[PDB]
Write an enzyme that holds these catalytic residues in place. Structure first.
Site, PDB file in Angstrom:
ATOM      1  N   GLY A  82      11.127  -1.115   7.135  1.00 41.05           N
ATOM      2  CA  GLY A  82      10.340  -2.253   6.272  1.00 41.05           C
ATOM      3  C   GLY A  82       9.204  -1.819   5.229  1.00 41.05           C
ATOM      4  O   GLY A  82       8.800  -0.622   5.348  1.00 41.05           O
ATOM      5  N   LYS A 130       3.219  -5.019   8.907  1.00 48.42           N
ATOM      6  CA  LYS A 130       4.494  -4.363   8.816  1.00 48.42           C
ATOM      7  C   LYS A 130       5.556  -5.214   8.780  1.00 48.42           C
ATOM      8  O   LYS A 130       5.677  -6.121   9.903  1.00 48.42           O
ATOM      9  CB  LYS A 130       4.891  -3.138   9.587  1.00 48.42           C
ATOM     10  CG  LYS A 130       6.010  -2.297   9.348  1.00 48.42           C
ATOM     11  CD  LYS A 130       6.578  -1.700  10.496  1.00 48.42           C
ATOM     12  CE  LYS A 130       5.959  -0.459  10.890  1.00 48.42           C
ATOM     13  NZ  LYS A 130       7.039   0.340  11.776  1.00 48.42           N
ATOM     14  N   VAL A 153       4.998  -2.493   4.510  1.00 44.67           N
ATOM     15  CA  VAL A 153       3.790  -2.645   4.976  1.00 44.67           C
ATOM     16  C   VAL A 153       2.860  -3.576   3.908  1.00 44.67           C
ATOM     17  O   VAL A 153       3.009  -3.150   2.607  1.00 44.67           O
ATOM     18  CB  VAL A 153       3.178  -1.317   5.596  1.00 44.67           C
ATOM     19  CG1 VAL A 153       1.874  -1.767   6.579  1.00 44.67           C
ATOM     20  CG2 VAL A 153       4.005  -0.564   6.468  1.00 44.67           C
ATOM     21  N   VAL A 171       0.821  -1.313  -0.061  1.00 43.93           N
ATOM     22  CA  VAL A 171      -0.055  -0.073  -0.165  1.00 43.93           C
ATOM     23  C   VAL A 171       0.852   1.254   0.071  1.00 43.93           C
ATOM     24  O   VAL A 171       0.304   2.261  -0.432  1.00 43.93           O
ATOM     25  CB  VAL A 171      -1.128   0.107   1.160  1.00 43.93           C
ATOM     26  CG1 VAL A 171      -2.559  -0.423   0.611  1.00 43.93           C
ATOM     27  CG2 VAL A 171      -0.894  -0.672   2.336  1.00 43.93           C
ATOM     28  N   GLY A 172       1.944   1.263   0.552  1.00 41.41           N
ATOM     29  CA  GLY A 172       2.818   2.469   0.606  1.00 41.41           C
ATOM     30  C   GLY A 172       4.013   2.309   1.305  1.00 41.41           C
ATOM     31  O   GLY A 172       4.555   0.941   1.808  1.00 41.41           O
ATOM     32  N   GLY A 185       6.167   2.528   4.676  1.00 40.30           N
ATOM     33  CA  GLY A 185       5.869   2.640   6.386  1.00 40.30           C
ATOM     34  C   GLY A 185       7.273   2.497   6.790  1.00 40.30           C
ATOM     35  O   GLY A 185       8.275   1.836   6.289  1.00 40.30           O
ATOM     36  N   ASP A 201       3.572   5.743  13.401  1.00 42.91           N
ATOM     37  CA  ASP A 201       5.022   5.915  13.446  1.00 42.91           C
ATOM     38  C   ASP A 201       5.677   6.796  14.547  1.00 42.91           C
ATOM     39  O   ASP A 201       6.747   7.542  14.533  1.00 42.91           O
ATOM     40  CB  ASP A 201       5.522   6.244  12.197  1.00 42.91           C
ATOM     41  CG  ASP A 201       5.321   5.448  11.157  1.00 42.91           C
ATOM     42  OD1 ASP A 201       4.878   4.099  11.608  1.00 42.91           O
ATOM     43  OD2 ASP A 201       5.186   5.496   9.945  1.00 42.91           O
TER      44      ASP A 201
HETATM   45  C1  LIG Z   1      -5.321   3.019   2.904  1.00 45.96           C
HETATM   46  C2  LIG Z   1      -4.372   4.216   3.357  1.00 45.96           C
HETATM   47  C3  LIG Z   1      -4.295   4.238   4.994  1.00 45.96           C
HETATM   48  N1  LIG Z   1      -3.762   3.230   5.427  1.00 45.96           N
HETATM   49  C4  LIG Z   1      -3.508   3.000   6.819  1.00 45.96           C
HETATM   50  O1  LIG Z   1      -4.506   3.098   7.505  1.00 45.96           O
HETATM   51  C5  LIG Z   1      -2.138   2.489   7.053  1.00 45.96           C
HETATM   52  C6  LIG Z   1      -0.875   3.116   6.659  1.00 45.96           C
HETATM   53  N2  LIG Z   1       0.130   2.492   7.340  1.00 45.96           N
HETATM   54  N3  LIG Z   1       1.306   2.537   7.090  1.00 45.96           N
HETATM   55  C7  LIG Z   1       2.345   2.117   7.924  1.00 45.96           C
HETATM   56  N4  LIG Z   1       2.018   1.385   8.982  1.00 45.96           N
HETATM   57  C8  LIG Z   1       0.833   1.236   9.344  1.00 45.96           C
HETATM   58  N5  LIG Z   1       0.594   0.293  10.474  1.00 45.96           N
HETATM   59  C9  LIG Z   1       1.430   0.128  11.309  1.00 45.96           C
HETATM   60  C10 LIG Z   1       2.148   1.260  12.439  1.00 45.96           C
HETATM   61  C11 LIG Z   1       2.892   1.261  13.213  1.00 45.96           C
HETATM   62  C12 LIG Z   1       3.584   2.171  14.115  1.00 45.96           C
HETATM   63  O2  LIG Z   1       2.698   3.522  13.955  1.00 45.96           O
HETATM   64  N6  LIG Z   1       4.261   2.240  14.727  1.00 45.96           N
HETATM   65  C13 LIG Z   1       4.328   2.926  15.988  1.00 45.96           C
HETATM   66  C14 LIG Z   1       5.752   3.779  15.944  1.00 45.96           C
HETATM   67  C15 LIG Z   1       5.533   2.652  16.899  1.00 45.96           C
HETATM   68  C16 LIG Z   1       3.759  -0.261  13.334  1.00 45.96           C
HETATM   69  C17 LIG Z   1       3.043  -1.064  12.548  1.00 45.96           C
HETATM   70  C18 LIG Z   1       2.158  -1.076  11.381  1.00 45.96           C
HETATM   71  C19 LIG Z   1       1.716  -2.207  10.830  1.00 45.96           C
HETATM   72  C20 LIG Z   1      -0.261   1.595   8.457  1.00 45.96           C
HETATM   73  C21 LIG Z   1      -1.606   1.733   8.552  1.00 45.96           C
HETATM   74  C22 LIG Z   1      -2.646   1.181   9.543  1.00 45.96           C
END
Ligand SMILES: CCCNC(=O)c1cn2ncnc(Nc3cc(C(=O)NC4CC4)ccc3C)c2c1C
Length: 339
Positions: free
Chosen positions: A32, A49, A34, A26-27, A29, A164
């Site tokens: 690594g 991720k 996602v 999807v993009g 992240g 993030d």
């Molecule tokens: C359709 C467009 C919108 N897309 C999303 O909702 C979306 C995009 N992303 N991108 C990266 N990580 C995500 N999730 C994610 C986030 C973190 C994170 O925020 N890390 C926190 C920093 C400690 C860690 C692991 C994961 C899978 C995530 C989500 C849910």
């Protein structure tokens, strides 16, 4: 232990259980790649991720452990949660892959603003939600340090999630000036700067500071906040920066009324209290919520602060096997969220 399966997705191997169906990149992240996936044992639309070489280094090992611990603690609506954490590993002396899971939203605030300018009620709901997220994150003594629209995930029903967080260290467009020019001791209010760069942008459809480098970015900054005064020019210590400012063209502060033309008076007022160049004068996440603009959304009884979060590991210097074991111990020991 579940039934596993091995597949490939854009020059990389993805080893994920039977339950995780349909995958897609999807993009971009943080750390690594996602994947957008469709769950079964809950049956929702998640984000997965895969970490890039999580233990290949002392930096990667201390950063793998860090994240897994932030998400095992973050239980707040507008804050990214942890649905699952897995490895194809049979043992610890195998465990060299890590995958973290959480819900997929509709789009990010960056793809939302692209199409296009958002009214005085959308903005009210979005900033309120960002800061109410920030308040939970902050009381656990964590800052974001890289808050910008792309890490602000949103639903069709406008419900918000912060991404993030707590990983950044060492976009500049929404970066605080004191953390970019090394002016002061700094605190949790560097994100309070970021929200005002975001707020203003949802109110105009124009990046407030689309600067080019640390010099152009800052020139764009004063070009709106007015060059440091008599109160500020005393506080700054940074010999390079302290001598750098007094050698710039004498600029005044602009009126946020004569910048954000047509804007709801209370937005103008809060923005002002956001782009303050004094890291100690500047408003806080909780302070910002008790502001007239959020009269309708604000209720202190549904804006919670976090359960104590242990950061003792953050000053610690450990070996890769130490970290790789701590993470392994946290991977095996996690217990799914209650429905
Ligand atoms: C359709 C467009 C919108 N897309 C999303 O909702 C979306 C995009 N992303 N991108 C990266 N990580 C995500 N999730 C994610 C986030 C973190 C994170 O925020 N890390 C926190 C920093 C400690 C860690 C692991 C994961 C899978 C995530 C989500 C849910």
């Amino acid at each position: 232990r579940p039934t596993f399966y091995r597949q490939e997705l854009n020059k990389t191997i993805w080893e994920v259980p039977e339950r995780y169906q349909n995958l897609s990149p999807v993009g971009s992240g943080a750390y690594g790649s996602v994947c957008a996936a469709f769950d079964t044992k809950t049956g929702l639309r998640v984000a997965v991720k895969k970490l890039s070489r999580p233990f290949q280094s002392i930096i990667h090992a201390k950063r793998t452990y860090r994240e897994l611990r932030l998400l095992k603690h973050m239980k707040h609506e507008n804050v990214i949660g942890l649905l699952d954490v897995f490895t194809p590993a049979r043992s610890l002396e195998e465990f060299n892959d890590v995958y973290l899971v959480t819900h997929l939203m509709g789009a990010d605030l960056n793809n939302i603003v692209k199409c296009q300018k958002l009214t005085d009620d959308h903005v009210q709901f979005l900033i309120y939600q960002i800061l109410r997220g920030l308040k939970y994150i902050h009381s656990a003594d964590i800052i974001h340090r890289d808050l910008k629209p792309s890490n602000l995930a949103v639903n069709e029903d406008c419900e918000l999630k912060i991404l993030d967080f707590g990983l950044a260290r060492h976009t500049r467009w929404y970066r605080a000036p004191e953390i970019m020019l090394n002016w002061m001791h700094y605190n949790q209010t560097v994100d309070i700067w970021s929200v005002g760069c975001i707020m203003a942008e949802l109110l105009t459809g124009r990046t407030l500071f689309p600067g080019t480098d640390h010099i152009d970015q800052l020139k764009l900054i004063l070009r709106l906040v007015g060059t440091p005064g008599a109160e500020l020019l005393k506080k700054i210590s940074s010999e390079s920066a302290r001598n750098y400012i007094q050698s710039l063209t004498q600029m005044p502060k602009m009126n946020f009324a004569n910048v954000f033309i047509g804007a709801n008076p209370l937005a103008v007022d809060l923005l002002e209290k956001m782009l303050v160049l004094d890291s100690d004068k500047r408003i806080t996440a909780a302070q910002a919520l008790a502001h007239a603009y959020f009269a309708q959304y604000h209720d202190p009884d549904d804006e919670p602060v976090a359960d104590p979060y242990d950061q003792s590991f953050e000053s610690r210097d450990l070996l890769i096997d130490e970290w790789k074991s701590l993470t392994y111990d946290e991977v095996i020991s996690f217990v799914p969220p209650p429905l």
